[PDB]
Amino acid sequence: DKRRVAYFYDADVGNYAYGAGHPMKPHRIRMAHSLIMNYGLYKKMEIYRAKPATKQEMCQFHTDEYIDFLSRVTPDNLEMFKRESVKFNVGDDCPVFDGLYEYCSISGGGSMEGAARLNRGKCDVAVNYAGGLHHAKKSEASGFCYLNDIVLGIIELLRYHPRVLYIDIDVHHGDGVEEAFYTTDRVMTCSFHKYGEFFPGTGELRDIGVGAGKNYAVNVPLRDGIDDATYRSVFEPVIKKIMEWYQPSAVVLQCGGDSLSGDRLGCFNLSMEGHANCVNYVKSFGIPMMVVGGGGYTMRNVARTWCFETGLLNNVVLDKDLPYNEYYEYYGPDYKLSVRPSNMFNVNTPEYLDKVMTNIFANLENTK
Amino acid sequence: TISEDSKVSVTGLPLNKGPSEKIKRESLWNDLKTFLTENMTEESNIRSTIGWNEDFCSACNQSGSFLCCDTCPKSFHFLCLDPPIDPNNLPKGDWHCNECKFKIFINNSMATLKKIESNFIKQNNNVKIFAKLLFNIDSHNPKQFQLPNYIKETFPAVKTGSRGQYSDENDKSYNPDTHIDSNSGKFLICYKCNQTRLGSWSHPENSRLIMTCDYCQTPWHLDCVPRASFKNLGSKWKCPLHSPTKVYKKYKVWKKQRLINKKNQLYYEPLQKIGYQNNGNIQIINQDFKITQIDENSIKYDFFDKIYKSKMVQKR
Amino acid sequence: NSIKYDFFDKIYKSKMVQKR
Amino acid sequence: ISLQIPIKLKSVLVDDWEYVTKDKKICRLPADVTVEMVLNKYEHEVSQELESPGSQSQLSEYCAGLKLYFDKCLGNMLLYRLERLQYDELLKKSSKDQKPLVPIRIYGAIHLLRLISVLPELISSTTMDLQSCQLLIKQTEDFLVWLLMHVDEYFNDKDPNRSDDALYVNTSSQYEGVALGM
Amino acid sequence: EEVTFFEKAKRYIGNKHLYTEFLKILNLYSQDILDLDDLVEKVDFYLGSNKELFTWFKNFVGYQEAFGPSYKRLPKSDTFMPCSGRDDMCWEVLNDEWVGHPVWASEDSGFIAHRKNQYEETLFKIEEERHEYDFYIESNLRTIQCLETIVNKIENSMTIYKKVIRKVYDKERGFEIIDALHETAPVVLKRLKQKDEEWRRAQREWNKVWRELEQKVFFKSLDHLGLTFKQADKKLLTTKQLISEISSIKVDQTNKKSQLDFDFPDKNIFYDILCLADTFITHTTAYSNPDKERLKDLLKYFISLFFSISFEKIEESSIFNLFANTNIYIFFRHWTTIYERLLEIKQMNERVTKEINTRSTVTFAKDLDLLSSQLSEMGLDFVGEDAYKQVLRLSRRLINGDLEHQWFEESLRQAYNNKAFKLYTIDKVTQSLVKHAHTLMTDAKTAEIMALFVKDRNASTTSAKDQIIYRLQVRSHMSNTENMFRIEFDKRTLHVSIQYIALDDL
Ligand SMILES: [Zn+2]
Ligand SMILES: [Zn+2]
Ligand SMILES: [Zn+2]
Ligand SMILES: [Zn+2]
Ligand SMILES: [Zn+2]
């Protein structure tokens, strides 16, 4: 195919940091960029610096009071915002750092500009790895996310595209995005997540949607330690059936790195190839694509996997050696472009996944 | 030149010294570059929208921000106040409790009866029975409502949680011992598949998880009943072999009677035993919370008649 | 439960007589 | 002293306790049937049958006293911690319009029923004469009997998720956070 | 066919406490409180495992929104808040009634996180220190670049620099310096450059330390089942465990003679197990020399007689039935366990050999700056020396005692990518196998049972009577409480079936 590929990257995105012990670091994106620049993929891609978003653009989803709080909160004056902190959940889990508003604006601008370029036809694949914050829901900060740039990008895409498909492969359920479009039948969400006593708490097999959006939300709950073959055997038939009986006009794919092995907070057992196979297979359909980077807390693994996925999007397969980037020492033992799956036990069983797939197909029978 | 810059790092070091020789001995054994992006970043701005005194609250007895009084050691929340005080709209003045201000301003111990009788005669024209209570309410601090310990205790399956919440009887590698009875030694046979599927230490992949429901102790496979994980933090898991106790008839609501302490629990048996229009409150063998005795043999008839009736009306 | 069988037989015969 | 609250009303009270403290729901205010409406219906329906001037006037005295006591003590001892946010919002909206708050015209039939459950505990902390304690208790018992008779038109079983005319409304995560976190 | 139906349901459910609930549901429907859908769903959960009663039920009663569990509905008054940018389309597609709030979906109990070994924690700490250094250094470098541009322009993206200057200037003078800058830049630039030099020196040294720390811990982190395998194998490789496994399979089968089925697709792993066993027997200071020779001869003779492999090829590298007691079965189970583990290691021999031999090295900085031959200096790096035979040699070293367990495990982890963790206890399993063989030869009952086995097996041509008398003869020596195993063997394809006759022969 050799599609035209846009690529959005603000050089200042890596200079914003959460707390010292926080598991979320934007710096990962910076390192990913190195692995893309030193592999000579700039000669294959057009690199844009997306214009940062404005308050009224974020207010297409969030409330005015929430954005007003975000744009003025600062670790120097948090004691002047006590009711707001407990109301909007901007306390300990999602903290306040120096550049919260600027980081959120950079992410939202990247996502909206990628959607706009998809709309106008300047490209058919847009990549923004500063986005993917899919936990904030219109009035509160959840799961390290403050602004739901996925919602803004999908809203922009809805202007020119009738239907949109959203695919989430992070270990956590896409709570914010599914909640934002739980009633409409023009944005179909499909989330493959780990369900149990896990952080989202939501996203069960019987959360198919309410009203006109009934049977337009897909939840795939999985057990711990799932491997490449099992994840592929679940991901491929479900996505194929969605593309057959729903026929989206555009696709958005959240390429969270929590599904990778050795993650700080995740419990899955996917390798680099097992996690890029989803991206490659979904790209193999031929519809306009947006790719965003959400979860991932082992910086080297997610950086290497993002570089590999970008290479795959550019129709080329990268070599295992590393090109001597700036952050070389991060890559440890053998400095290979690989992520090793562990030997952990895989709990998912063919009968359980057959039951889940049968339920999902029965629910999807009423989408065409 | 500032010297206090070197405070601390995650390395436990001033970020200027080095490997911390103790750490040395602990942790030792014995296609161009990126400076080109700035000249290739074409700024994209083609967006469609581009043109646009204690630690507990004295009212609720919980933890939080408090507004205590200087004279009475009784901290209060902000919503736990009458009227609630917005923290931004501080009074900025001498603040005292209702009881505190009553005891600090109108404290006439030798003449309070005069005020009491004055209020009594002021309310005597219209409402004399409530006059004492109307006077007394101003002498008490704001409080949170609580059931008075005898509404609670008439239902034995109801208890008070930590912060006063309502709790009921639903509050709560390769492991081969989970399939053992742990009480008799017999394997736990799943209700649906009729197998234990213990697997083997050579091939743990052949084992299937089992759950042993909390209410009736029937063991279930996590793959038989579709369920991702076990239950360890939430309410007691209930197997799907129990009565609903809450039915939304097509809308209308039906509920099962709560459990009553056996002293007040009256029982009755109908003399008909052919057909009784009674609720789902039965027992298999003040007149509002009775427990009927359904006399199981009757049900075999009852159910049948209904479906037979349903077989005739739908026939025509 | 024999009286149950008698009741079932008689009632069913009555239903079929109704639908003669 | 010895208040004989019917079993059904006790179950209703414990159901309200569960609904507020566990399911995180609040009352749909202003209520469809406030305290004023139900008390006036009781007074109109019952006092027309009595003939003794004392028995007919003391009923009105008791009703007026109950209204005044409810007005005085709802904001003091009749609300849980979760429901204080609704009270604060009502107070703010009332002060916006210079109208003093009248809880007997806002709340209804479930906060009154929870008003007469601590009345035995409320009288005990007074100097009330025993010849009037029995009168108050008997009047309350008569009112409770009347309420139990008309129980299906003040406590219905309706789901908030299926009808906006239900007696209870769910609380938003922001509402719950402000109420139980600050 | 209806009262009989009720009797059949009562028998099939088989529990009074569940039949009572079934009757409660049936009555709840019978009083016009339950609809057809829920009634059939409950009857499917009760009798749906059967296909006769439930189908007749469905064809006899003329059977012929979906709100999610995690979503609430908010009142209309709690919906309309000012959203300035929301247009008509942005109003129609968004949902404002239903909210999830994971606190509600967790039953106010919280969540259970994953369990991570201490090696993963060490890696996370190293990553945290690396991120701190890189974040501070890059921010300071960007501020230096901006100040350099300004200085170059003065010869004749709004809070990063302020944060950098605040971090550098800690005497609360930083605000004054920033304000002076907004209206004196060279001094800030040179101080930032000096700080950059200091931080980069410290980063280089700490990078050395971090690399040498990560080298000894990274591969242990992915060894999830390997770290607990020793204790788990010690607990789970007992006689009671195997008896429980075979009895559970028997119980499952009976609820509807080949309880266990092993296939042997190779004939040379036996020789490797023999080599390991004789190595242990020679090394162990727990048997006398006559006992050692007895053990060796008994092992060789037993395997030759069982598998019909050879009598001389072992020393230079029809359907049969064995009626066995517990000791013989446990010894055979130990043998099968060792063979299965070795076969699993052998199956992937070519792939692992190619991976080790075709192991590329990066020339940019590995071979130029940082050389790590810690596992190569000791020769445990599988260069040449086909991985199966090298693993066997290392196992012999471990059993002999000149190779520590730590380095053996590390070599296996590095050579097999944590896919060969079941060899961690090869020495102990071989020791247990030798002990079980000795117990088999030092007990009169087992000795006589295997004497009968030898006689019947060497007969090799018997009528149908043997299966009786053999059993009876074995039963002549077994008690009335111990259990009996019928190990069938097909030599034509080297397949071993095992059946569990606990006490079903009396
Ligand atoms: Zn995630
Ligand atoms: Zn309080
Ligand atoms: Zn006070
Ligand atoms: Zn089962
Ligand atoms: Zn149960």
Short mmCIF file of N, CA, C and O in Angstrom, two decimals, chain D residues 79-138:
data_model
loop_
_atom_site.label_atom_id
_atom_site.label_comp_id
_atom_site.label_asym_id
_atom_site.label_seq_id
_atom_site.Cartn_x
_atom_site.Cartn_y
_atom_site.Cartn_z
N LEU D 79 -30.97 14.77 58.58
CA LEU D 79 -30.25 14.57 57.33
C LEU D 79 -28.97 13.79 57.56
O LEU D 79 -28.24 14.04 58.53
N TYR D 80 -28.69 12.85 56.67
CA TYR D 80 -27.42 12.13 56.67
C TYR D 80 -26.29 13.07 56.24
O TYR D 80 -26.50 14.25 55.96
N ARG D 81 -25.07 12.54 56.20
CA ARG D 81 -23.95 13.34 55.74
C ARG D 81 -23.99 13.57 54.24
O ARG D 81 -23.58 14.63 53.76
N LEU D 82 -24.46 12.58 53.48
CA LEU D 82 -24.52 12.72 52.02
C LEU D 82 -25.53 13.79 51.62
O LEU D 82 -25.29 14.54 50.67
N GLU D 83 -26.66 13.87 52.32
CA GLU D 83 -27.73 14.78 51.95
C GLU D 83 -27.47 16.22 52.35
O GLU D 83 -28.28 17.09 52.02
N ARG D 84 -26.38 16.50 53.06
CA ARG D 84 -26.08 17.88 53.43
C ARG D 84 -25.74 18.74 52.22
O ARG D 84 -25.93 19.96 52.27
N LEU D 85 -25.25 18.13 51.14
CA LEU D 85 -24.95 18.90 49.93
C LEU D 85 -26.23 19.40 49.27
O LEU D 85 -26.28 20.54 48.79
N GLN D 86 -27.26 18.55 49.22
CA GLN D 86 -28.55 18.99 48.70
C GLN D 86 -29.12 20.12 49.54
O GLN D 86 -29.68 21.09 49.00
N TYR D 87 -28.98 20.03 50.86
CA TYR D 87 -29.44 21.09 51.75
C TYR D 87 -28.69 22.39 51.48
O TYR D 87 -29.30 23.46 51.42
N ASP D 88 -27.37 22.31 51.31
CA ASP D 88 -26.59 23.51 51.04
C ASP D 88 -26.97 24.14 49.70
O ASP D 88 -27.07 25.36 49.58
N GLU D 89 -27.19 23.30 48.68
CA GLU D 89 -27.61 23.82 47.38
C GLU D 89 -28.98 24.48 47.46
O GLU D 89 -29.22 25.53 46.85
N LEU D 90 -29.91 23.87 48.20
CA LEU D 90 -31.22 24.47 48.39
C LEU D 90 -31.11 25.81 49.11
O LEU D 90 -31.78 26.78 48.74
N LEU D 91 -30.27 25.88 50.14
CA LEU D 91 -30.07 27.14 50.86
C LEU D 91 -29.50 28.21 49.94
O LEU D 91 -29.92 29.37 50.00
N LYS D 92 -28.52 27.85 49.11
CA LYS D 92 -27.93 28.82 48.19
C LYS D 92 -28.97 29.32 47.19
O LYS D 92 -29.09 30.53 46.96
N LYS D 93 -29.74 28.40 46.60
CA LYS D 93 -30.75 28.81 45.63
C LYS D 93 -31.85 29.63 46.28
O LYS D 93 -32.43 30.51 45.63
N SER D 94 -32.15 29.37 47.55
CA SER D 94 -33.17 30.15 48.25
C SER D 94 -32.67 31.55 48.57
O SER D 94 -33.38 32.54 48.37
N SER D 95 -31.43 31.66 49.07
CA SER D 95 -30.86 32.97 49.35
C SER D 95 -30.64 33.78 48.07
O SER D 95 -30.61 35.01 48.14
N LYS D 96 -30.50 33.11 46.93
CA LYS D 96 -30.42 33.83 45.66
C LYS D 96 -31.71 34.58 45.36
O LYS D 96 -31.68 35.63 44.70
N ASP D 97 -32.85 34.09 45.84
CA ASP D 97 -34.15 34.68 45.54
C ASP D 97 -34.80 35.35 46.75
O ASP D 97 -36.00 35.64 46.71
N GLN D 98 -34.04 35.59 47.82
CA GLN D 98 -34.50 36.24 49.04
C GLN D 98 -35.63 35.49 49.74
O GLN D 98 -36.23 36.03 50.67
N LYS D 99 -35.93 34.26 49.32
CA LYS D 99 -36.96 33.46 49.96
C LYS D 99 -36.37 32.68 51.13
O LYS D 99 -35.39 31.96 50.94
N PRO D 100 -36.90 32.82 52.34
CA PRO D 100 -36.49 31.93 53.43
C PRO D 100 -36.88 30.49 53.13
O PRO D 100 -37.89 30.22 52.48
N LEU D 101 -36.06 29.56 53.62
CA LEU D 101 -36.28 28.15 53.35
C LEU D 101 -37.42 27.60 54.21
O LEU D 101 -37.50 27.87 55.41
N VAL D 102 -38.29 26.81 53.57
CA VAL D 102 -39.42 26.19 54.26
C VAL D 102 -39.35 24.69 54.02
O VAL D 102 -39.94 24.18 53.06
N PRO D 103 -38.63 23.94 54.86
CA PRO D 103 -38.45 22.50 54.60
C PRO D 103 -39.75 21.71 54.56
O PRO D 103 -39.82 20.69 53.86
N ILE D 104 -40.78 22.14 55.29
CA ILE D 104 -42.06 21.44 55.24
C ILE D 104 -42.71 21.57 53.87
O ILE D 104 -43.59 20.78 53.52
N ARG D 105 -42.29 22.55 53.07
CA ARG D 105 -42.77 22.72 51.71
C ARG D 105 -41.82 22.12 50.67
O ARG D 105 -42.07 22.26 49.47
N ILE D 106 -40.75 21.45 51.10
CA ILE D 106 -39.76 20.90 50.19
C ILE D 106 -39.67 19.39 50.37
O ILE D 106 -39.94 18.62 49.44
N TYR D 107 -39.28 18.96 51.57
CA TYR D 107 -39.19 17.54 51.88
C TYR D 107 -40.58 16.97 52.14
O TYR D 107 -41.54 17.70 52.39
N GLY D 108 -40.68 15.65 52.08
CA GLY D 108 -41.99 15.06 52.31
C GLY D 108 -42.08 13.57 52.54
O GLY D 108 -41.53 12.76 51.78
N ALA D 109 -42.78 13.20 53.62
CA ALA D 109 -43.34 11.88 53.85
C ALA D 109 -42.30 10.81 54.16
O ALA D 109 -42.67 9.70 54.57
N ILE D 110 -41.02 11.12 54.01
CA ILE D 110 -39.99 10.14 54.33
C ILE D 110 -39.02 10.76 55.33
O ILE D 110 -38.40 10.05 56.13
N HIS D 111 -38.91 12.08 55.31
CA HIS D 111 -38.20 12.77 56.37
C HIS D 111 -39.10 13.04 57.57
O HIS D 111 -38.60 13.18 58.69
N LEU D 112 -40.42 13.11 57.35
CA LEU D 112 -41.35 13.14 58.47
C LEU D 112 -41.38 11.79 59.18
O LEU D 112 -41.36 11.73 60.41
N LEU D 113 -41.43 10.70 58.41
CA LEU D 113 -41.42 9.37 59.01
C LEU D 113 -40.14 9.12 59.79
O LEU D 113 -40.17 8.42 60.81
N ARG D 114 -39.02 9.68 59.34
CA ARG D 114 -37.79 9.61 60.10
C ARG D 114 -37.70 10.69 61.17
O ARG D 114 -36.81 10.62 62.03
N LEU D 115 -38.58 11.69 61.14
CA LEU D 115 -38.71 12.59 62.28
C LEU D 115 -39.36 11.88 63.46
O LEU D 115 -38.86 11.96 64.58
N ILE D 116 -40.47 11.17 63.22
CA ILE D 116 -41.04 10.37 64.30
C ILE D 116 -40.43 8.98 64.24
O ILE D 116 -41.09 7.99 63.91
N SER D 117 -39.15 8.90 64.61
CA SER D 117 -38.50 7.68 65.05
C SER D 117 -37.56 7.93 66.21
O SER D 117 -37.28 7.00 66.98
N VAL D 118 -37.06 9.16 66.37
CA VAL D 118 -36.28 9.57 67.52
C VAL D 118 -37.11 10.37 68.51
O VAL D 118 -36.56 10.87 69.51
N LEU D 119 -38.41 10.53 68.25
CA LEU D 119 -39.28 11.21 69.21
C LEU D 119 -39.24 10.57 70.59
O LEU D 119 -39.20 11.32 71.58
N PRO D 120 -39.27 9.24 70.75
CA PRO D 120 -39.01 8.68 72.08
C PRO D 120 -37.65 9.07 72.63
O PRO D 120 -37.51 9.31 73.83
N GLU D 121 -36.63 9.14 71.77
CA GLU D 121 -35.32 9.60 72.19
C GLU D 121 -35.25 11.11 72.34
O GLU D 121 -34.33 11.62 72.98
N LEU D 122 -36.19 11.84 71.74
CA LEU D 122 -36.18 13.30 71.84
C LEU D 122 -36.87 13.78 73.11
O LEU D 122 -36.40 14.72 73.76
N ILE D 123 -37.99 13.14 73.47
CA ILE D 123 -38.71 13.52 74.68
C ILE D 123 -37.88 13.20 75.92
O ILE D 123 -37.93 13.94 76.91
N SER D 124 -37.10 12.12 75.88
CA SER D 124 -36.38 11.67 77.07
C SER D 124 -35.43 12.74 77.60
O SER D 124 -35.18 12.80 78.81
N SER D 125 -34.89 13.58 76.73
CA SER D 125 -33.99 14.65 77.17
C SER D 125 -34.75 15.95 77.40
O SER D 125 -34.36 17.01 76.92
N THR D 126 -35.83 15.89 78.17
CA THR D 126 -36.64 17.06 78.50
C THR D 126 -37.14 16.92 79.93
O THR D 126 -36.69 16.05 80.69
N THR D 127 -38.07 17.79 80.31
CA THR D 127 -38.76 17.73 81.59
C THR D 127 -40.26 17.57 81.37
O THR D 127 -41.09 18.23 82.00
N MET D 128 -40.62 16.67 80.45
CA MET D 128 -42.01 16.54 80.02
C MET D 128 -42.81 15.74 81.04
O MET D 128 -42.34 14.72 81.56
N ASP D 129 -44.02 16.21 81.32
CA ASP D 129 -44.88 15.54 82.29
C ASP D 129 -45.45 14.26 81.71
O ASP D 129 -45.78 14.19 80.52
N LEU D 130 -45.59 13.24 82.56
CA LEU D 130 -46.02 11.92 82.10
C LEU D 130 -47.45 11.92 81.58
O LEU D 130 -47.80 11.05 80.78
N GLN D 131 -48.28 12.87 82.02
CA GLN D 131 -49.66 12.92 81.54
C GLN D 131 -49.77 13.43 80.12
O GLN D 131 -50.79 13.21 79.46
N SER D 132 -48.74 14.12 79.62
CA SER D 132 -48.70 14.57 78.23
C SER D 132 -47.81 13.71 77.35
O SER D 132 -47.98 13.71 76.13
N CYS D 133 -46.87 12.97 77.94
CA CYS D 133 -46.10 12.01 77.17
C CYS D 133 -47.01 10.96 76.54
O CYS D 133 -46.86 10.62 75.37
N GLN D 134 -47.98 10.46 77.31
CA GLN D 134 -48.91 9.47 76.78
C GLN D 134 -49.77 10.08 75.68
O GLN D 134 -50.08 9.41 74.69
N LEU D 135 -50.17 11.35 75.83
CA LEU D 135 -50.96 12.01 74.80
C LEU D 135 -50.17 12.13 73.50
O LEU D 135 -50.67 11.82 72.42
N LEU D 136 -48.92 12.59 73.61
CA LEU D 136 -48.07 12.71 72.42
C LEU D 136 -47.85 11.36 71.76
O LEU D 136 -47.96 11.23 70.53
N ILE D 137 -47.56 10.34 72.56
CA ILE D 137 -47.30 9.01 72.01
C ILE D 137 -48.55 8.45 71.33
O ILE D 137 -48.46 7.88 70.24
N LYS D 138 -49.72 8.61 71.96
CA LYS D 138 -50.94 8.08 71.37
C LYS D 138 -51.30 8.82 70.08
O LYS D 138 -51.75 8.20 69.11
#
